[model samples]
Target: SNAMYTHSKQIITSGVPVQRAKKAVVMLHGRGGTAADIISLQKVLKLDEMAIYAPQATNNSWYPYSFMAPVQQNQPALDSALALVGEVVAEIEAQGIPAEQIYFAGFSQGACLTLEYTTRNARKYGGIIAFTGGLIGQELAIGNYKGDFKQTPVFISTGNPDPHVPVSRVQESVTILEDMNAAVSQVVYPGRPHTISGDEIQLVNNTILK
Candidate 1:
C-alpha cells in the first residue's frame, strides 16, 4: 500500500542524468537532514556516470520514531516511509533503468532504512551502501528477514564508538547480511562521531564504483 503521506514527500537529484547514464544512486538522508545532505556525498563518490536521486522526508525523517523502537510503535509512518523507498525505486526504474542497475545508499537513519528496505525487497541490485545504519528494530534477528540477496555487494561503514548508532547493531547487521549470502564489506572506524568521513567516501567509491 502506498502511504498517503508520501504524496507530499519531496526528492532532490543531482540532475546528472542528462549524460545518458545507465546507472543511478538513490541517496537517503538522515534525521534532520534534507535531500541535499546525502546528495552531497555524490560529489566525492566520483562516479559521474551514475545519476543520483535523493528523496526528502515529509518531516525531515523517514519515521516518526527511532530505528530501535518497536516495529509496531513506528508503524504506519515506517510503513509509509518504506513504501516511499519502493516508490522511488520503481519511479527510477520507469525511466528505463533496470532494477539491478539502481543502487541504494544512505547515512545513519537513512542507512538503517536503506538496509531494511533492501533486505525486505531482496533481489539483485546494482549494490547496497549502508553507512552508519543497521536493519531496523532493537535486535538483528534473522527470522525477521525473508529474502535472498543473490550475492549482492553490500558495503557497511560504522564507527566503533558511534554515539548515535550502537556498534552492536552494526555488527549484527553485518552478520545478518553475511548469513543472507551477501558479499559484505564492512569497516569499523575508531573514535569517530556520528558523522561520515573521508575514508568512508573512498570506501564507497571503491566498493560501488569499481
Candidate 2:
C-alpha cells in the first residue's frame, strides 16, 4: 500500500552534484513551509561545493499539533516524515557520501524533526544546525534513542522565551545530545525573535561548517 506514500514526498535539489560534492546537507522546512523555502538558505549559508536536499512535507506540516504533545497525537504524519529523512540519507550514502559527510539542518518544526531524527539515529556526522527546535514528545522518549554521535558538532539555538517551543525543552534536549557525545553548541538569545539570527550564522560558519 502507498500508506501516505512517504517516498513520494518531493525533494528540491541544489548546490553541487553527487559526483563531486564532499558534503551532503539535508534541510527540512518548518510547518507550512516548502522545500524551496529552506533551500534558499543554502546560498545564505554560503556552503560552497556541497550537495543539498530539502524535502517538503506532504501538507505544509510534518505533523499536526504541538511537538510537545503526545506522540500518538501526531499520528502517521510523524512517522511518515521521519521515514522520509532516512530515505534521503540512504540515497546520499549510495552516492559515496558517508555518514560523516552528511549534515541535517532545519528551523522550527523542522528543527524539532531534525533533532529527533539525528539523535534517534545518532552517529558521527558533518554536523547538525537546528534553529529554535527541540526533541518531540510530551516527554523525552529517551529509550527510543541509542548510539553515540562520537562528538558530532551540533548547533541549537532559541530565544529566552519562544512563542512556540519553550527554552526548557531546548535545555533538556541539549543535555541529551551532550550525553550522547555530540559536541553541542547551544545558545539562548535574550529578547530575540524566533527567526534565525546573523550571530547564529557566524557561529555555525565558525563551528559546524568546519
Q: Judged by TM-score, which candidate is best?
A: 2
Error of 2 at 195 (Å): 0.4
Pairs clashing within candidate 2? 32-60
Question: Can you write out model 2's per-residue Cα lDDT over 96-201, one digit (the tens) per residue?
Answer: 9999989989999999999999998999999999999999999889998888999999999999877788999999999999999999999999999979999988
- How many steric overlaps does candidate 1 have? 0
lDDT of 1 by residue, 1-210 (tens): 222344255767784672476888888999888998788776677657778888888878787677887776666777788878888888788888887888888998899999998887788888999889989975554676777888889999888786667878888888888878888998889988778898988877877667
The candidate that achieves the highest lDDT relative to the unseen native structure: 2
TM-score of 1: 0.90
Show how many residue pairs clash in every candidate, following the order shown: 0, 1
Assess candidate 2 and give its TM-score to the true structure.
Answer: 0.95
Candidate 2 whole-model C-alpha lDDT, 0 to 1: 0.89
> What's the residue-level lDDT of 110 in candidate 1?
94
Off by over 4 Å in 2: 1-7
TM per model?
0.90, 0.95
